[model samples]
Target chain A: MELTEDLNMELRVFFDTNKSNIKDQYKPEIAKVAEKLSEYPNATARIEGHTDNTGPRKLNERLSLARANSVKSALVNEYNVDASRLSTQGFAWDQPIADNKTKEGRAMNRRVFATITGSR
Target chain B: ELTEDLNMELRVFFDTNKSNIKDQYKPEIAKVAEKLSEYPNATARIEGHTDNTGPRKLNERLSLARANSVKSALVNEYNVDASRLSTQGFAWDQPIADNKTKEGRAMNRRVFATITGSR
Candidate 1:
């Protein structure tokens, strides 16, 4: 798959409820993403954490960052991607690809997006 | 109307027609819990507020539920002392914003975590 600025691939990193600790079953997908980034030695990746509008803005904002950090940690420690090439951020419930009011929408909202920022 | 000590430092906002604390506001409530924990003797008066568009009785109950919701979060999630917490529903009686516009109404639909002590 071509890694474009718009090519933000969704990894199947399953998260524990409200906690940053993620399920190991989804690590292979994360490693796959890491491998793609590893292909470009000079490439950088940005990890984002998000939640459904099911929570308040400020609270979700901070926790999303925690989630983002958690993913970044996995990329570095587990996948052996370059630590300096990875960055993380939290968007809270501000950006959603689905409805925030429904259960399926919330499941979609509670996600992490891995975007390759730049590559030489 | 008055607090021996009330600081509006943190406000937990809610969605339209919803009373349960959202997963999004847990961290803010956690912040309040941390603050209360810091001041062992301080008591919190969680004030539930509402916009003026709704009927008086429904809005009142909604406001009260919102307040108690935050209280429950603090106690259940963060191990906050339940006895030290109290809830009140103001029901649009004293709004920080005007009840005219959407922005104003959303601002009004919130729970304020205010402390009531020198500690």
Candidate 2:
């Protein structure tokens, strides 16, 4: 007999100018994540936020944290993702995917990526 | 560089923001006094520096006062040769570390006397 093991989810969300508040355009993606969590009731997800280094070092630290928290809220609220099965954390300018000095680089750094890793 | 044994030791002291030599640094100042007495012909260069956390001009003044304070300690407390001491004060811009941190700032507030023109 084969068991049902749908235990993987992945999604990407982006933030606004110098801000981490969820943009309206990414609502669809959030909804999709909610749907996935519902399907994989035993799966756990982690939301991680990242930022560039163009701003004041202290303020950038706070901004990165806020951005990650913003996405976590959406999953738990609109997507009905269970708060217990989710973990949210921020990695400030310390872990940048791109150089912060250029527009393109900054855009790449301002992102929230989620990973679903667990099994029922 | 004068042989470490032949060099004069001067200890400079600070009074809030002033560099004028004071009695507080007499212990380090006496070391210079004893060294200068051991070698009569040795001359020294006293150097001073300030931290950037404060006004630039004020830091300059502080540096100057600190160097002078040490020079006086050698002369008055140890009765060393006055002609052997040359003093200087350099302001905060030439620092080796960032002035933004507490440990770094503590390093900027200092003065030192070097033994010069030795065999």
Candidate 3:
């Protein structure tokens, strides 16, 4: 996993739908991740989607996957990054960084992680 | 570096996507909590992990919740000090067994309690 140290940026995307679109607030952060991906031709980014435990398990899972996929799409379409360099997975509410009982915590929980790893 | 004698490692297994510590493992956790009580200055690190299945982000949260559940059990049921317990969640990234098989995924889902310093 030779990812950039700053790859784990706080891209908290509060979602209300299944659309795979990155928000304006996180454009710069996503750009950073895409930039890193372009720099490392041998590296592939694992875009992980996360969310708070606010709704149904299945829905959260779907939302999380959609979030990861949207980031991957952004990198490919907006940044001209190769699709082969990206992979996506949704983790839903399984890995929460903050206590879900609070508003800030729930907001923090909804995030996307771009973890870079070596590829074949 | 920690000598093996001064540190303790207890790996607790779990059911699929579940965070509750089983009754069978209660006594084992209690024993560890009991040991923690013996050394008032010691602290325990609880790490939650899960098998590779379903959503990855949700697994992360489940893993963390699993860790917290254990910590609560130790503090509430086993009478362990709440302030001495710290927690972490690693989801499916760090698996001890092959997640491709049922038995292996069963083995991969676990909580590792690391306690340093004992009387």
Name the better of 2 and 3 by DockQ.
Answer: 3
Q: Which stretches of candidate 1 lie over 4 Å from their true place?
A: A1-120, B1-8, B116-119
Which candidate's DockQ is highest? 3
What TM-score do all the candidates reach, one by one?
0.45, 0.47, 0.47
Model 3's number of clashes is 14
Off by over 4 Å in 3: A1-120, B1-5
Q: What is the C-alpha RMSD of each candidate to the true structure, in Å?
A: 21.9, 23.6, 20.3
**Distance from true location, Cα of B28 in model 2, Å:** 91
Clashes of each: 6, 4, 14
The alpha-carbon deviation from the true structure for residue B117 of candidate 1, after best TM-score superposition, in angstroms, is 4.4
| lDDT, model 2, position B45 | 85
- Candidate 1 lDDT over residue span B41-80, tens digit each: 7777788988887699988999999999888887888898
Per residue, candidate 1 scores C-alpha lDDT tens digits across A89-112 of 888888888896788887777777
DockQ of each: 0.01, 0.00, 0.01
Between 1 and 3, whose lDDT is larger?
3
Evaluate candidate 1 and give its CAPRI docking class based on DockQ. Answer: incorrect
